[PDB]
């Protein structure tokens, strides 16, 4: 992603993906993608960005 927000918006999809609890917090919602080797992308990209 070349924007910080549509970055934030993909980690979003993710997060409904992994089911991530409203009550998790952000890191918490990041090792959801970062363990998972297909979001790996998205585990990068939250460095990135």
């Not at 609890?21 to 998790?24: E, F, G, L, T």
């Given at each position: 992603w070349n924007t910080k927000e549509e970055a934030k918006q993909a980690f979003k999809e993710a997060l409904k993906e992994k089911r991530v609890?409203?009550?998790?917090s952000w890191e918490q919602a990041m090792k959801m993608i970062i363990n998972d080797p297909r979001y790996s992308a998205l585990a990068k990209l939250s460095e990135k960005k």
């Open positions: 609890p409203s009550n998790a």
